[PDB]
Each structure stands twice: as C-alpha cells, then as structure tokens.
Amino acid sequence: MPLDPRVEQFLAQMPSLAEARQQFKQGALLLDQMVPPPPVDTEDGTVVTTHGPVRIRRYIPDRLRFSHPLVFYHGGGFVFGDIDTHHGLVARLCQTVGATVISVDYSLAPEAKFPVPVAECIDVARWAAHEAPGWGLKPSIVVAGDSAGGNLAAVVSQRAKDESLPIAAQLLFYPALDMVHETPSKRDFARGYLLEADAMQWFGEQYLRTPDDVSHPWASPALSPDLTGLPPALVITAEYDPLRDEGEAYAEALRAAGVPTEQIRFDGMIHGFMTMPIFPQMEAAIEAVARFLERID
Numbered sequence: 001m002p003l004d005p006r007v008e009q010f011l012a013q014m015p016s017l018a019e020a021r022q023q024f025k026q027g028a029l030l031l032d033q034m035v036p037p038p039p040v041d042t043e044d045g046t047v048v049t050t051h052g053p054v055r056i057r058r059y060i061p062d063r064l065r066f067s068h069p070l071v072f073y074h075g076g077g078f079v080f081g082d083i084d085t086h087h088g089l090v091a092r093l094c095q096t097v098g099a100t101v102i103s104v105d106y107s108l109a110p111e112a113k114f115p116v117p118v119a120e121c122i123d124v125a126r127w128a129a130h131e132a133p134g135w136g137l138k139p140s141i142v143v144a145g146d147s148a149g150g151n152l153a154a155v156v157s158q159r160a161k162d163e164s165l166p167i168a169a170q171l172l173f174y175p176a177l178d179m180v181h182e183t184p185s186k187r188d189f190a191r192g193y194l195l196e197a198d199a200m201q202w203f204g205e206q207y208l209r210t211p212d213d214v215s216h217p218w219a220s221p222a223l224s225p226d227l228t229g230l231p232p233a234l235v236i237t238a239e240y241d242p243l244r245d246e247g248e249a250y251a252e253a254l255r256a257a258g259v260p261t262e263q264i265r266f267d268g269m270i271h272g273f274m275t276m277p278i279f280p281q282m283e284a285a286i287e288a289v290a291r292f293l294e295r296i297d
Ligand SMILES: CCCC[C@H](CC)COC(=O)c1ccccc1C(=O)O
Pocket: 030, 031, 033, 034
C-alpha cells in the first residue's frame, strides 16, 4: 500500500544525551503547536514504587464514560520522552474515551537500566488498581503504551496474574516485543522510516544490562510460551514500521490463545504516528481505542 501523502511529505522534509533528549522534546512541542491538544484537567503527583518515587499525571475527562482507569506508559526507546512529550496523545485518549488516565514518568535509561522501569510500571499499575474504587471506578485497569511504552504495557500485562494485579485490557501502539528475532519488517524497513536499526541498537545498549537481556521475558514478551488468560488486547501497527511484524505476530498469538484481540494495521503509516497529530490517522487510532474499550464492559 503506498505511503500516506502527508507521511511522504513529512519524511521528505525530515532533515550528547541531554541534547538529544531536548531535541526529541522540541520535536513534540512543534507538533503540538501545529495541532493543539484539547484542553483537559490534570493533577500532577508522585507514586512510591519499589525503585523510588515516580512522577505521574492524572487526566480527568470532561465526561466520565469508561469505568476503568487507564495507565499509560510513554514511548521513546526507554531513553527519551516524558509526560509532556506524550501529552498530545494522552489528552485525546482521556477526552475521546472519557476515561481517567494516569500517564507515567518512569525512569529512563541509561541512568536506570532494565528491568527497573518494568518494576516501576507494575508498581504504578498496582497503585492505580488500589486507588480506583476511591475514584468510583472499577479496580481493574487498562494499561497502554506506544513503542517502548507498548513493550512496558505488554510486560505488565504478562506479570499481572503473578503480581495479583487486575488488568481489564492492554492497548499496544506499535510496541517493541521481541529483541531476539529479526522479522521481515525489521529487515525491510530498517532505514528511512523515522525509527531505524542503528537507533534501536543504540537504544538496546542504553536499556539492557547485557546482550543476554534480549531473551529475558520482561524485555521480549513475545517469547512467552503461554499467553492464555492475558487481558483483552488492542494491537495497533503501522505498515512501514520495522516493529510491525513482531506486533502483528504477537496479536495472532494472543488470538490463538483465546484472548479477545483486535489487530489494526494503519496502511501507509510509520512508527510514532499516534504522537504525530499532523496525521489524521492519530485521531482515527484514538477512536479505535474508544470503540475497543466500549466492548470491555
Ligand atoms: C517558533 C518557531 C519554531 C522553530 C521551528 C524549527 C525549524 C521552525 O518553525 C516552524 O516552521 C514551525 C512553527 C510552529 C510549529 C511547527 C513548525 C515546524 O517546524 O513545522
């Protein structure tokens, strides 16, 4: 399927650690200014985790129409991003679904290494489940994330059982799921579609303790042999994304394990598109999220 016209243009006009973090954040700013987010009530807070205090931001919708909190983990290769860089997405998730959303500022690599952010994300999910009844919501949460954050939501969902954590659904937006295998998509779209091989490698070096960590189930959830009884899954991929094939294979695996699964590929799109509000497909995907969550209760 051909590249989306606007994606094509965006890619055509595409030109230290702390610098690179600031540059990523600048990029998200320029997108937000091009396409402003909806206004939304938010409270900033801090959750006490087993690895320290983790800043969160709670989004409260104008109208509450979904009975479970969402816990959102931002993407950025485990190295970049924060609650601000992903505000544009979370505000829309909050207002379109009409859900409370907890956006999580988990600790970034290389300062924090795998598996520290997994622990933090589980702890925040556990906190949200506990608090939920106090907000007049159900205790079971929905976990959500893009890219690296989709990795985290996938892992938190696999741990859920064992950690006595009620999760009602998982929303995976072009997640990283398999750091061991090369897929066709990872081979064929390795360069020129915003997320590249070089970057993914460098990201892995920042995040992982050793090359052995790639086969760890908390790094590569796609390797887990028993997927039965995992939470209902929405898996959104981009057609021209190195990560596409691992995402779509994992959705196929969930489906065959009897998990209620929706798998949606956005044709002509690239990685990152759900934090790029210059593309209308970002809003279409957010509408997919709201329709999927309607079916949960
Ligand atoms: C204050 C100007 C920011 C600096 C940038 C950097 C080259 C150049 O400004 C623009 O072209 C621009 C402005 C607003 C939103 C998006 C953009 C844009 O880059 O697409």
